[PDB]
Paper text:
During mitotic exit, PP1, in particular PP1γ (PP1 isoforms include PP1α, PP1β, PP1γ and PP1γ2; ≥ 85% identity between isoforms), is essential for histone dephosphorylation, nuclear-envelope reassembly and chromatin remodeling. These PP1γ-specific processes are mediated largely by the Ki-67:PP1γ and [name]:PP1γ holoenzymes. Ki-67 (3256 aa) and [name] (1023 aa) bind PP1γ to form isoform-specific holoenzymes.
The Ki-67/[name] residues C-terminal to the canonical RVxF motif are not present in any other PP1 regulator whose holoenzyme structure is known, suggesting these regulators bind PP1 using a novel mechanism. To identify this mechanism, we determined the crystal structures of the Ki-67496-536:PP1γ7–308 and RepoMan383-423:PP1γ7–308 holoenzymes complexes to 2.0 Å and 1.3 Å, respectively. As predicted by the ITC and NMR studies, Ki-67 and [name] bind PP1 using an identical mechanism. PP1γ is in grey and Ki-67496-536 is in pink with the 2Fo–Fc electron density map contoured at 1σ (2.0 Å); no electron density was observed for Ki-67 residues 496–503 (pink dotted line) and 536. Ki-67 residues 503–516 and [name] residues 390–403 bind the PP1 RVxF and ΦΦ binding pockets (cyan surface; the Ki-67 and [name] RVxF and ΦΦ SLiM residues are labeled and in italics). Ki-67 residues 517–535 and [name] residues 404–422 bind the newly defined KiR-SLiM binding pocket (beige surface). This orders PP1γ L1, a loop that is generally more dynamic in most free PP1 and PP1 holoenzyme structures as evidenced by its higher B-factors and less well-defined electron density.
Residue numbers in the entry:
A (entry chain A): 7 to 299
B (entry chain C): 503 to 535
The structure:
Protein backbone atom coordinates (compact mmCIF):
# COMPACT_ATOMS: atom_id res chain seq x y z
CA UNK A 1 0.00 0.00 0.00
CA UNK A 2 1.66 3.19 -1.25
CA UNK A 3 0.31 5.73 1.23
CA UNK A 4 2.35 8.52 -0.37
CA UNK A 5 0.91 7.82 -3.82
CA UNK A 6 -2.62 7.74 -2.40
CA UNK A 7 -2.14 11.08 -0.64
CA UNK A 8 -0.57 12.63 -3.75
CA UNK A 9 -3.56 11.55 -5.86
CA UNK A 10 -6.18 12.81 -3.42
CA UNK A 11 -4.33 16.12 -3.15
CA UNK A 12 -4.01 16.42 -6.95
CA UNK A 13 -7.31 18.36 -7.24
CA UNK A 14 -6.03 21.16 -4.97
CA UNK A 15 -5.64 23.21 -8.13
CA UNK A 16 -8.75 21.96 -9.91
CA UNK A 17 -12.26 23.30 -10.29
CA UNK A 18 -14.56 21.75 -7.65
CA UNK A 19 -16.42 18.65 -8.87
CA UNK A 20 -13.43 16.58 -10.02
CA UNK A 21 -13.41 13.07 -8.57
CA UNK A 22 -10.39 11.05 -7.39
CA UNK A 23 -11.03 7.34 -7.97
CA UNK A 24 -8.51 5.21 -6.11
CA UNK A 25 -8.47 1.50 -6.80
CA UNK A 26 -10.96 -0.49 -4.74
CA UNK A 27 -8.08 -2.50 -3.24
CA UNK A 28 -6.33 0.68 -2.09
CA UNK A 29 -9.44 1.94 -0.31
CA UNK A 30 -9.85 -1.44 1.41
CA UNK A 31 -6.21 -1.13 2.46
CA UNK A 32 -6.94 2.33 3.87
CA UNK A 33 -9.72 0.86 6.01
CA UNK A 34 -7.78 -2.18 7.22
CA UNK A 35 -4.66 -0.30 8.28
CA UNK A 36 -6.44 2.66 9.88
CA UNK A 37 -8.76 0.25 11.70
CA UNK A 38 -5.62 -1.42 13.03
CA UNK A 39 -4.30 1.96 14.27
CA UNK A 40 -7.62 3.01 15.83
CA UNK A 41 -7.80 -0.29 17.71
CA UNK A 42 -4.21 0.08 18.88
CA UNK A 43 -4.89 3.60 20.25
CA UNK A 44 -7.16 4.42 23.22
CA UNK A 45 -10.85 4.91 22.60
CA UNK A 46 -10.61 8.02 24.79
CA UNK A 47 -7.71 9.92 23.26
CA UNK A 48 -5.35 11.79 25.57
CA UNK A 49 -4.05 14.58 23.35
CA UNK A 50 -1.54 17.39 23.72
CA UNK A 51 -1.76 20.90 22.27
CA UNK A 52 -1.11 22.55 19.93
CA UNK A 53 -3.66 21.15 17.52
CA UNK A 54 -6.56 22.32 15.38
CA UNK A 55 -10.01 20.83 15.97
CA UNK A 56 -12.57 20.50 13.18
CA UNK A 57 -16.29 19.81 13.20
CA UNK A 58 -18.48 18.18 10.56
CA UNK A 59 -17.08 17.81 7.05
CA UNK A 60 -19.90 15.65 5.60
CA UNK A 61 -18.23 14.74 2.32
CA UNK A 62 -17.56 18.33 1.20
CA UNK A 63 -14.10 17.44 -0.02
CA UNK A 64 -13.00 20.70 -1.64
CA UNK A 65 -13.95 22.57 1.55
CA UNK A 66 -11.83 20.08 3.50
CA UNK A 67 -8.91 21.02 1.26
CA UNK A 68 -9.75 24.70 1.80
CA UNK A 69 -9.66 24.10 5.56
CA UNK A 70 -6.23 22.45 5.21
CA UNK A 71 -5.22 25.37 2.97
CA UNK A 72 -5.89 27.68 5.97
CA UNK A 73 -5.00 25.44 8.91
CA UNK A 74 -1.95 23.97 7.23
CA UNK A 75 -1.72 20.67 5.44
CA UNK A 76 -0.59 17.66 7.57
CA UNK A 77 1.84 17.51 9.11
CA UNK A 78 2.31 21.32 9.43
CA UNK A 79 -0.43 21.23 12.07
CA UNK A 80 -1.83 18.52 14.32
CA UNK A 81 -5.51 17.75 13.78
CA UNK A 82 -8.45 16.34 15.69
CA UNK A 83 -11.68 15.87 13.74
CA UNK A 84 -14.92 15.41 15.68
CA UNK A 85 -16.69 13.07 13.26
CA UNK A 86 -19.22 13.14 10.43
CA UNK A 87 -16.93 12.71 7.45
CA UNK A 88 -19.47 11.02 5.22
CA UNK A 89 -23.09 11.68 4.17
CA UNK A 90 -24.81 14.77 2.72
CA UNK A 91 -21.87 15.99 0.62
CA UNK A 92 -21.01 14.92 -2.90
CA UNK A 93 -17.56 13.44 -2.17
CA UNK A 94 -17.67 11.39 1.03
CA UNK A 95 -15.32 8.86 -0.58
CA UNK A 96 -12.51 11.34 -1.25
CA UNK A 97 -13.05 12.90 2.19
CA UNK A 98 -12.73 9.75 4.30
CA UNK A 99 -9.88 8.33 2.19
CA UNK A 100 -7.77 11.45 2.67
CA UNK A 101 -8.53 11.48 6.40
CA UNK A 102 -7.75 7.78 6.78
CA UNK A 103 -4.60 8.15 4.67
CA UNK A 104 -3.56 11.06 6.90
CA UNK A 105 -4.22 8.86 9.93
CA UNK A 106 -1.97 6.08 8.60
CA UNK A 107 0.69 8.58 7.54
CA UNK A 108 0.86 10.59 10.81
CA UNK A 109 -0.71 8.24 13.38
CA UNK A 110 0.59 10.33 16.29
CA UNK A 111 -0.34 13.71 14.79
CA UNK A 112 -3.69 13.10 13.05
CA UNK A 113 -6.78 11.91 14.92
CA UNK A 114 -10.37 11.13 13.98
CA UNK A 115 -13.30 10.71 16.36
CA UNK A 116 -16.49 8.81 15.59
CA UNK A 117 -19.54 10.84 14.61
CA UNK A 118 -23.13 9.70 14.34
CA UNK A 119 -22.75 9.35 10.56
CA UNK A 120 -19.88 6.86 10.97
CA UNK A 121 -22.68 4.40 11.62
CA UNK A 122 -24.10 1.84 9.21
CA UNK A 123 -27.73 2.59 10.08
CA UNK A 124 -27.23 6.33 9.53
CA UNK A 125 -24.99 6.51 6.45
CA UNK A 126 -27.07 3.80 4.78
CA UNK A 127 -29.79 6.40 4.18
CA UNK A 128 -27.91 9.76 4.14
CA UNK A 129 -25.65 9.28 1.17
CA UNK A 130 -22.50 7.27 1.79
CA UNK A 131 -24.04 3.87 1.01
CA UNK A 132 -25.43 5.14 -2.28
CA UNK A 133 -22.03 6.67 -3.11
CA UNK A 134 -20.13 3.45 -2.40
CA UNK A 135 -22.64 1.56 -4.49
CA UNK A 136 -22.45 3.60 -7.71
CA UNK A 137 -18.71 4.40 -7.67
CA UNK A 138 -17.58 1.01 -6.32
CA UNK A 139 -19.79 -1.60 -4.66
CA UNK A 140 -21.62 -2.57 -1.47
CA UNK A 141 -18.72 -4.79 -0.42
CA UNK A 142 -16.62 -1.63 0.04
CA UNK A 143 -19.33 0.06 2.13
CA UNK A 144 -19.32 -2.90 4.53
CA UNK A 145 -15.53 -2.62 4.74
CA UNK A 146 -15.92 1.03 5.79
CA UNK A 147 -18.43 0.03 8.48
CA UNK A 148 -15.91 -2.33 10.05
CA UNK A 149 -13.42 0.56 10.08
CA UNK A 150 -15.89 3.09 11.55
CA UNK A 151 -16.83 0.59 14.28
CA UNK A 152 -13.25 0.96 15.56
CA UNK A 153 -13.09 4.76 15.69
CA UNK A 154 -12.50 6.43 19.06
CA UNK A 155 -15.41 8.35 20.50
CA UNK A 156 -13.85 11.04 22.70
CA UNK A 157 -10.63 12.94 23.36
CA UNK A 158 -9.30 15.07 26.20
CA UNK A 159 -6.66 17.70 25.36
CA UNK A 160 -4.24 18.74 28.12
CA UNK A 161 -6.76 17.39 30.67
CA UNK A 162 -8.83 20.55 30.07
CA UNK A 163 -10.85 20.27 26.81
CA UNK A 164 -13.36 17.41 26.48
CA UNK A 165 -14.05 16.56 22.84
CA UNK A 166 -16.75 14.41 21.30
CA UNK A 167 -19.14 14.63 18.40
CA UNK A 168 -22.52 14.99 20.10
CA UNK A 169 -22.46 15.78 23.77
CA UNK A 170 -22.77 14.74 27.39
CA UNK A 171 -24.68 11.73 28.75
CA UNK A 172 -26.53 11.25 32.04
CA UNK A 173 -24.62 7.97 32.27
CA UNK A 174 -21.18 9.59 32.08
CA UNK A 175 -20.02 9.68 35.68
CA UNK A 176 -16.42 8.53 35.30
CA UNK A 177 -14.03 8.86 32.38
CA UNK A 178 -13.29 5.16 33.06
CA UNK A 179 -16.69 4.32 31.57
CA UNK A 180 -15.61 5.48 28.12
CA UNK A 181 -12.42 3.41 28.31
CA UNK A 182 -14.31 0.21 29.13
CA UNK A 183 -16.22 0.37 25.84
CA UNK A 184 -15.02 -2.46 23.61
CA UNK A 185 -14.34 -2.16 19.89
CA UNK A 186 -15.43 -2.95 17.22
CA UNK A 187 -18.93 -1.86 18.24
CA UNK A 188 -22.04 -0.51 16.56
CA UNK A 189 -23.85 2.57 17.90
CA UNK A 190 -26.76 1.45 20.12
CA UNK A 191 -30.09 3.26 20.06
CA UNK A 192 -29.53 4.42 23.64
CA UNK A 193 -26.82 4.67 26.24
CA UNK A 194 -23.43 6.19 26.93
CA UNK A 195 -21.91 5.76 23.48
CA UNK A 196 -25.13 6.83 21.79
CA UNK A 197 -25.28 10.08 23.75
CA UNK A 198 -21.64 10.98 23.08
CA UNK A 199 -22.40 10.88 19.33
CA UNK A 200 -25.97 12.22 19.45
CA UNK A 201 -26.87 14.56 22.31
CA UNK A 202 -27.28 18.35 22.03
CA UNK A 203 -27.13 21.29 24.41
CA UNK A 204 -30.29 23.31 24.91
CA UNK A 205 -30.58 26.60 26.80
CA UNK A 206 -34.27 25.93 27.57
CA UNK A 207 -33.68 22.62 29.44
CA UNK A 208 -32.74 22.62 33.11
CA UNK A 209 -31.04 19.21 33.37
CA UNK A 210 -31.62 16.31 30.94
CA UNK A 211 -34.46 16.58 28.45
CA UNK A 212 -36.11 15.08 25.40
CA UNK A 213 -34.20 15.32 22.12
CA UNK A 214 -36.58 15.63 19.14
CA UNK A 215 -34.00 13.85 16.90
CA UNK A 216 -35.77 10.84 18.41
CA UNK A 217 -32.47 9.70 19.92
CA UNK A 218 -30.51 10.59 23.06
CA UNK A 219 -31.01 13.75 25.17
CA UNK A 220 -30.60 17.47 25.36
CA UNK A 221 -28.68 18.94 28.30
CA UNK A 222 -28.65 22.33 30.01
CA UNK A 223 -26.01 24.84 31.06
CA UNK A 224 -26.02 23.52 34.64
CA UNK A 225 -25.20 19.99 33.45
CA UNK A 226 -22.24 21.42 31.52
CA UNK A 227 -20.98 23.40 34.53
CA UNK A 228 -21.41 20.49 36.97
CA UNK A 229 -19.56 18.23 34.53
CA UNK A 230 -16.60 20.59 34.09
CA UNK A 231 -16.22 21.15 37.83
CA UNK A 232 -16.47 17.44 38.62
CA UNK A 233 -13.73 16.45 36.15
CA UNK A 234 -11.67 19.68 36.45
CA UNK A 235 -12.14 20.58 32.78
CA UNK A 236 -12.49 24.03 31.23
CA UNK A 237 -14.33 23.47 27.95
CA UNK A 238 -16.55 21.03 26.07
CA UNK A 239 -15.89 20.93 22.30
CA UNK A 240 -18.50 19.21 20.17
CA UNK A 241 -19.92 19.35 16.67
CA UNK A 242 -23.19 17.73 15.48
CA UNK A 243 -25.16 20.95 14.70
CA UNK A 244 -25.08 23.61 11.99
CA UNK A 245 -23.88 26.95 13.39
CA UNK A 246 -24.04 30.10 11.26
CA UNK A 247 -20.61 31.47 12.24
CA UNK A 248 -18.95 28.04 12.06
CA UNK A 249 -18.61 28.08 15.86
CA UNK A 250 -21.06 28.93 18.61
CA UNK A 251 -20.66 29.15 22.38
CA UNK A 252 -23.02 27.77 25.01
CA UNK A 253 -23.26 28.36 28.77
CA UNK A 254 -20.88 31.31 29.25
CA UNK A 255 -18.27 29.85 26.87
CA UNK A 256 -18.10 26.56 28.83
CA UNK A 257 -19.09 24.67 25.65
CA UNK A 258 -18.45 25.36 21.96
CA UNK A 259 -20.04 23.80 18.86
CA UNK A 260 -17.87 23.49 15.74
CA UNK A 261 -19.19 22.95 12.23
CA UNK A 262 -16.62 22.93 9.46
CA UNK A 263 -18.64 22.45 6.26
CA UNK A 264 -19.46 25.90 4.80
CA UNK A 265 -22.73 26.44 2.92
CA UNK A 266 -23.88 23.08 4.23
CA UNK A 267 -25.61 20.97 1.52
CA UNK A 268 -26.17 24.14 -0.45
CA UNK A 269 -29.09 24.58 1.97
CA UNK A 270 -27.70 26.73 4.80
CA UNK A 271 -26.01 30.07 5.30
CA UNK A 272 -23.05 29.03 7.46
CA UNK A 273 -19.32 29.53 7.62
CA UNK A 274 -17.02 26.69 8.61
CA UNK A 275 -14.70 26.93 11.58
CA UNK A 276 -11.75 25.23 13.23
CA UNK A 277 -10.64 25.71 16.81
CA UNK A 278 -6.88 26.21 16.94
CA UNK A 279 -5.46 25.46 20.40
CA UNK A 280 -1.93 26.62 21.18
CA UNK A 281 0.41 25.00 23.71
CA UNK A 282 -0.92 27.50 26.29
CA UNK A 283 -4.50 26.28 25.60
CA UNK A 284 -5.45 29.70 24.21
CA UNK A 285 -8.18 28.76 21.74
CA UNK A 286 -8.85 30.74 18.58
CA UNK A 287 -11.43 30.10 15.88
CA UNK A 288 -10.17 30.08 12.29
CA UNK A 289 -13.19 30.68 10.04
CA UNK A 290 -13.64 29.45 6.45
CA UNK A 291 -16.11 31.91 5.03
CA UNK A 292 -17.70 31.85 1.58
CA UNK A 293 -18.07 35.00 -0.51
CA UNK B 1 -1.51 28.15 35.05
CA UNK B 2 -2.56 25.57 32.37
CA UNK B 3 -6.06 26.94 31.58
CA UNK B 4 -8.32 27.58 28.61
CA UNK B 5 -8.33 31.07 27.17
CA UNK B 6 -9.89 32.45 23.99
CA UNK B 7 -8.11 34.67 21.50
CA UNK B 8 -9.48 37.60 19.58
CA UNK B 9 -11.50 37.34 16.41
CA UNK B 10 -9.53 36.23 13.36
CA UNK B 11 -10.15 37.35 9.79
CA UNK B 12 -11.47 34.29 7.93
CA UNK B 13 -10.17 32.66 4.79
CA UNK B 14 -12.58 33.98 2.18
CA UNK B 15 -13.20 31.52 -0.69
CA UNK B 16 -15.15 31.35 -3.93
CA UNK B 17 -16.95 28.01 -4.16
CA UNK B 18 -15.94 27.91 -7.87
CA UNK B 19 -12.24 28.60 -7.35
CA UNK B 20 -9.68 25.85 -6.64
CA UNK B 21 -8.72 25.37 -2.97
CA UNK B 22 -5.31 26.51 -4.30
CA UNK B 23 -6.78 29.97 -5.06
CA UNK B 24 -8.27 31.57 -1.92
CA UNK B 25 -9.76 35.04 -2.16
CA UNK B 26 -8.41 36.37 1.17
CA UNK B 27 -5.89 34.62 3.40
CA UNK B 28 -7.48 34.13 6.81
CA UNK B 29 -5.63 35.54 9.77
CA UNK B 30 -3.29 33.18 11.58
CA UNK B 31 -3.25 32.69 15.42
CA UNK B 32 -0.28 34.08 17.40
CA UNK B 33 0.90 33.17 20.91
NA1 LIG C 1 -8.32 12.27 31.31
Amino acid sequence: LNIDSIIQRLLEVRGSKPGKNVQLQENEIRGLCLKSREIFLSQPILLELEAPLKICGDIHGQYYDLLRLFEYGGFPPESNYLFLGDYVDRGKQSLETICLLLAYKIKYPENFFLLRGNHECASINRIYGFYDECKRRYNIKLWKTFTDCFNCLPIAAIVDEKIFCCHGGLSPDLQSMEQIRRIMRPTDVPDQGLLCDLLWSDPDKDVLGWGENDRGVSFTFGAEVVAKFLHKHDLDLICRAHQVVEDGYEFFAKRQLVTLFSAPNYCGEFDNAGAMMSVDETLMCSFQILKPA
Amino acid sequence: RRRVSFGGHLRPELFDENLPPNMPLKRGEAPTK
